[PDB]
């Protein structure tokens, strides 16, 4: 009932190629009119179109890209596929597959382009220096930075501390990311109350805890 | 290429009034009587959800507020009664002639009351300084409207390199907002310098919010 499933590489140095499949079940690429289209949405920007296979063979790319796409049906195996060759860095996106190139969207899978390895993060504290205040409210922080690949997790107190928390998105900074939590509690909590960061990176196979403790 | 030139950029709007946003194309998007311009609303995280299609069609299980209307250039997208839910971002595809094209998007955000910023700013923990960095933090928080400016400056001086900025989207329960910006520097350099100032321009305030420390 059209299920559209884009398979791809996770991570991909700069300058291979990116082999993408699309896997659609519920509706035939014989169909007269039918299509499927690749598009993508890079990190935090908007969409952008790259191609479409038409049910008669006929392929139509996005110019800007054009000479590095080529897309193919095998209508025996219910799979449409892209390739991009000599990727780049703003290849990074998450590249998507549409019925008709609007009426049915597949998941997404992300493609990550980069030549760093796994850096497993730094996390470090972030105390305040003193002076209670601020509805005496104290707020605390936990960097963590230099880490590659996405996710870490950040939890506040093992996910007890769940009001007060603002953890901010990870950005790159020379191919690593740097993310950072706040958490924000009355005087009456801290330092009467420990408060600790717990960063987990799966890819490297690493926890932390960090108690933030007065400077 | 049929350009599309969505407007507002912004919408703040209240649970309960009509929120419209428009999509304007450069040409025609029809093929006279079928009107190639579909609507998508996208929450952060999600993958496209498609709307409306073919200007005025609902999908399947979108919640009937949703109206498509338009027709050739002009088209609009009629969120009413604009719910917690809908605060997201609007899309408009074209899809009359390849390549297709999207508008540059609408992020629709529930209004409230101004806040002024929380600023909190954080010298480098011992840890990294160990390690040979220095990286000192500001997070500005609980804050409406979006619009503020973070400014370092370092011995008086506006430091604007080495800085890294993120937002956090608008909160679900107070809706307001927060960012975080941290300004890397080497061990030397944060070691030859005395006060760091982290300084924030808010809608809220005459002239600006500033945290700073010495070492």
């Known amino acids: 009932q059209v299920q559209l499933q884009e398979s791809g590489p996770g991570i991909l140095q700069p300058s291979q190629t990116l082999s993408l499949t699309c896997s659609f079940s519920?509706?035939?690429?014989?169909?007269?009119?039918?299509?499927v289209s690749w598009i993508r949405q890079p990190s935090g920007k908007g969409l952008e179109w790259l191609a479409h296979?038409?049910?008669?063979?006929?392929?139509r790319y996005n110019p800007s890209l054009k000479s590095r796409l080529k897309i193919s049906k095998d209508t025996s195996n219910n799979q449409v596929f892209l390739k991009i060759t000599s990727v780049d860095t703003a290849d990074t996106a998450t590249y998507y597959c549409?019925?008709?190139?609007?009426?049915?969207w597949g998941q997404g899978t992300s493609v990550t382009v980069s030549s760093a390895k796994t850096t497993a993060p730094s996390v470090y504290p972030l105390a305040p220096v003193c002076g209670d205040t601020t509805g005496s409210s104290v707020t605390l922080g936990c960097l963590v930075k230099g880490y590659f690949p996405e996710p870490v997790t950040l939890t506040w107190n093992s996910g007890s501390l769940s009001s007060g928390v603002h953890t901010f998105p990870a950005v790159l900074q020379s191919d690593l990311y740097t993310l950072s939590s706040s958490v924000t509690v009355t005087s009456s909590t801290w330092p009467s109350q420990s408060i600790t960061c717990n960063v987990a990176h799966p890819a490297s196979s690493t926890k932390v805890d960090k108690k933030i403790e007065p400077r | 290429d049929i350009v599309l030139t969505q407007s507002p950029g912004s919408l703040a709007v209240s649970l309960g009034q009509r929120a419209t946003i428009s999509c304007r194309a450069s040409?025609?998007?029809?093929?006279?009587?079928?009107?190639?311009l579909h609507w998508y609303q996208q929450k952060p995280g999600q993958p496209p959800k498609l709307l409306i299609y073919?200007?005025?069609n609902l999908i399947s299980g979108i919640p009937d507020r949703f109206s498509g209307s338009g027709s050739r250039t002009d088209f609009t997208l009629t969120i009413n009664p604009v719910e917690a839910d809908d605060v997201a971002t609007y899309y408009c595809?074209?899809?009359?002639?390849?390549?297709?094209?999207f508008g540059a998007g609408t992020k629709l955000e529930i209004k409230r009351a101004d806040a002024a910023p929380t600023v909190s700013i954080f010298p480098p923990s011992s840890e990294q300084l160990t390690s040979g960095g220095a990286s000192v933090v500001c997070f500005l928080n609980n804050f409406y409207p979006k619009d503020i400016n973070v400014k370092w400056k370092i011995d008086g001086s506006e430091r604007q390199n080495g800085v890294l900025n993120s937002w956090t989207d608008q909160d679900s329960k107070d809706s307001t907002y927060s960012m975080s910006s941290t300004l890397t520097l080497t061990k030397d350099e944060y070691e030859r310098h005395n006060s760091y100032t982290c300084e924030a321009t808010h809608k809220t305030s005459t002239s600006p919010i500033v945290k700073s420390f010495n070492r």
């Open positions: 519920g509706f035939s690429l014989s169909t007269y009119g039918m299509g």
């Open positions: 040409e025609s998007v029809d093929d006279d009587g079928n009107s190639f």
């Open positions: 595809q074209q899809s009359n002639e390849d390549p297709l094209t």
């Open positions: 296979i038409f049910w008669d063979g006929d392929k």
């Open positions: 549409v019925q008709e190139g609007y009426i049915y």
């Open positions: 073919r200007s005025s």
